Amino acid sequence: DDEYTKLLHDGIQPVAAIDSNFASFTYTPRSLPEDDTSMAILSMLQDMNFINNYKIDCPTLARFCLMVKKGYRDPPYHNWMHAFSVSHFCYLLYKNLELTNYLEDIEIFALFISCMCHDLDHRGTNNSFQVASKSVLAALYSSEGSVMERHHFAQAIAILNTHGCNIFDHFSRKDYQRMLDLMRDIILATDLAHHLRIFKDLQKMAEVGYDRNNKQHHRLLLCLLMTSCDLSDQTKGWKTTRKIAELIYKEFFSQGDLEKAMGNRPMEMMDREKAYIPELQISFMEHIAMPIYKLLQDLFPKAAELYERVASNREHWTKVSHKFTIRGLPSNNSLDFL
Ligand SMILES: COc1ccc(Cc2nn3c([C@@H](CCCc4ccccc4)[C@@H](C)O)nc(C)c3c(=O)[nH]2)cc1OC
Ligand SMILES: [Mg+2]
Ligand SMILES: [Zn+2]
């Protein structure tokens, strides 16, 4: 593979050379060509100075990065570009929110690596599908819940344990353990069921105020930051959120079609004959995404622009909802669709 050759021998490019706006909340990482993303991951790790901080072997890191990228499939939304954009948001939080005042370096490093790995081997199907379709993943994990998230973590472990890919193998036995426990907790935090379970604890933390000496506050904050990274497409301009909604519903409806094919009745949001996209997106933005970015703003006043963009995008869904009702004739002037 020549992609590895270049990552290894060309040198780690400075982040500023990628784009003048690369470290800004206005930057859209999906604009970066996919062939430049692995070098961008090295550039971000170097700019956060984790390579020198942790004495990471650059050939091992290059192999690890390429293995993680190869570990993603190509469903419409849950692909490497999603993992890359999530990792890029983690980097933006580091650069704009001064995370070093709240978390340990090892926790921030674990959060970034978790962002890269958090949807490994996603097939475009959700946790409920695994159980309903009686998949091997359900057989392995259904009794413990968070089926896909347990699989994503297991895939990350399998990559670390691949010859020449263990970026942490020189860590002390305490730090190596710490890193795996952090990756496990952070990846499991991407299940909506987990976020709903900890939501009251997040509210309590934001209410009492963050305590850097409280180990449970560090853990809760990492969960909040991970979910803020995972939903970060919603903090970009309208155009980005509109295209990402297209990708998500294409993926969801392909799942619903598989379910109908197996004789199952899919949930309304996975059924292309029932799902009403503006109501579903408004519910997601108002009840799930906005409270996450509002908690982020409560803890970090500099995150106010993120919450304001999510609120602005939520308002835009109300503004264009009327377009889902066909007034007049369709574009082709035909009633053939009837
Ligand atoms: C009312 O409930 C929903 C309404 C709409 C959706 C579709 C959706 N899912 N979504 C997602 C995830 C769901 C994220 C669930 C979550 C997990 C942890 C913390 C918060 C949310 C999908 C693609 O898997 N990311 C984004 C940016 C979106 C997005 O804009 N829309 C999903 C919903 O529930 C899962
Ligand atoms: Mg996921
Ligand atoms: Zn994700």
What would the DSSP string read from start to end of 208-248?
H---TT-HHHHHHHHHHHHHHHHTGGGGS-HHHHHHHHHHH
Ligand 1 site-directed mutation target among 28, 231, 314, most atoms within 8 Å of CB: 231
Range of the domain at 17: 1-338
What was the resolution (in A) of this experimentally determined structure?
A: 1.8
| C-beta of residue 222 within 8 angstroms of C-beta of residue 107 | yes
CB contact set of 322 (below 8 Å; sequence gap of 6+): none
Question: Which ranges of 231-302 would DSSP assign to H, the alpha helix?
Answer: 238-261, 277-284, 290-299
To the question of whether residue 36 is assigned a binding role by annotation, the answer is: no
Is 185 one of the annotated binding-site residues? Answer: no
Ligand closest to Cα of 148 equals 2
Q: Find out whether the beta carbon of 146 lies less than 6 Å from any atom of ligand 1.
A: no
Tokens 């962002």 found at: 115
Protein residue with its CA nearest to atom 6 in ligand 1: 284
Number of domains observed in the structure of the chain: 1
- Single out the residue of 53, 65, 54 nearest to residue 6, CA to CA: 65
* Count of Cβ atoms closer than 10 Å to residue 9 Cβ: 9
d(CA 260, CA 277): 20
Cα–Cα distances (Å) from 107 to 39, 67, 181, 221, in that order, read 23, 22, 10, 10
Query: Is 211 among the annotated ligand-binding positions?
Result: no
Which distant-in-sequence residues (6+ apart) come within 8 Å of 156 by Cβ?
68, 114, 117, 120, 183, 187
- Nearest C-alpha to atom 34 of ligand 1 is from which residue? 284
Task: Tell how far the Cα of 180 is from the centroid of ligand 1, in angstroms.
Answer: 26
| Structure tokens given for 28 | 């859209």
Distances (CA, A) of 246 to 137, 251, 311: 27, 9, 19
- Cβ of 172: how many Cβ atoms within 10 Å? 8
- Do 68 and 60 contact (CB within 8 A), yes or no? no
Q: Catalytic residue positions?
A: 78
CB 192 near ligand 1, within 6 Å: yes
| Biggest alpha carbon–alpha carbon distance for the chain | 69
Question: What's 99's domain CATH number?
Answer: 1.10.1300.10
Backbone angles phi, psi at 17, to 5 degrees: -75, -15
CA atoms within 13 A on the CB side of 158: 12
Give the torsion sign (CA, 198, 199, 201, 206): positive
Report d(CA 61, CA 50) in Å as an integer.
Answer: 11
CB 276 less than 6 A from any atom of ligand 1: no
Torsion of CA 225, 228, 233, 235, to 10 degrees: -110
Q: Which ligand is nearest to the CA of 228?
A: 1
For residue 235, which phi and psi values (nearest 5 degrees)? -90, 0
Of residues 191, 187, 280, 242, the one with CA closest to residue 30: 242
Q: Is the CB of 231 under 6 A from ligand 1?
A: yes
The 8-class DSSP code of residue 168 comes to T
- Helices 147-160 and 58-70: crossing angle in degrees, nearest 10, is 140
- The gap between the terminal CA atoms of the chain, to the nearest Å, is 52
Burial of 199 (0-12, 13-18, 19+ CB in 10 A): middle
Is the shortest distance between the CB of 236 and ligand 1 below 6 Å? no
User: Which technique?
Assistant: X-ray
Q: Number of helices (H) and strands (E), helices first, in the chain?
A: 16, 0
- Residue ranges of E strands in 76-176: none
CB 284 within 8 A of CB 219: no
At 103, the amino acid letter reads L
Q: CA-CA distance, 145 to 111, in Å (whole number)?
A: 22
Amino acid at the residue 233: D
What is the chain's alpha carbon radius of gyration, rounded to the nearest angstrom? 21
Q: Is 230 annotated as a binding residue?
A: yes
- CA 188 remoteness from chain centre: 12
Q: What's the 22 CA to ligand 3 centre distance in angstroms?
A: 21
Q: Which structure tokens are listed for 168?
A: 């942490």
Which amino acid is it at 143?
Answer: S
- CB 195 near ligand 1, within 6 Å: yes
